[PDB]
Design a protein around this ligand. Structure first.
Ligand SMILES: O=c1ccn([C@@H]2O[C@H](CO)[C@@H](OP(=O)(O)O)[C@H]2O)c(=O)[nH]1
Length: 124
């Protein structure tokens, strides 16, 4: 009984740490958040800002989604994030990732009532 909003929080939110993600961060996080249960999710981004700040993006800059849909929004301010990218030698179930911190604008898709983030589209 996990909503799309809850799923977005599980896959993309990590407010706790003021971003100091070690080189082990993604290996631990991708596993702890169950993103390597059925397969090694190739790419996944974690946002370190507050839930309120990320939810607020749904009222910010409306931009086209990569899939052509029109319900994506870009944050006006840059946000602290951590990108997780599966390594080349990574082999399920032992999913391995490269951890890379960044400060960029995020683009999320929003749906529902309340209108909240349900998909992370990209960082720019
Ligand atoms: O910078 C990026 C690009 C893509 N993705 C994620 O990679 C998947 C394929 O695009 C998407 O996950 P989903 O299918 O569960 O919504 C998207 O959120 C990220 O996390 N960060």
């Amino acid at each position: 009984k996990e909503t799309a909003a809850a799923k977005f929080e599980r896959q993309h939110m990590d407010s706790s740490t003021s971003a100091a993600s070690s080189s082990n961060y993604c290996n631990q996080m991708m596993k702890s958040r169950n993103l390597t249960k059925d397969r090694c999710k190739p790419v996944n981004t974690f946002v370190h800002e507050s839930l309120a700040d990320v939810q607020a993006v749904c009222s910010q800059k409306n931009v086209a989604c990569k899939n052509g849909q029109t319900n994506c929004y870009q944050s006006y301010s840059t946000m602290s994030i951590t990108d997780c990218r599966e390594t080349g030698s990574s082999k399920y179930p032992n999913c391995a990732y490269k951890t890379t911190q960044a400060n960029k604008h995020i683009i999320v898709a929003c749906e529902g009532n309340p209108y909240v983030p349900v998909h992370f589209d990209a960082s720019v």
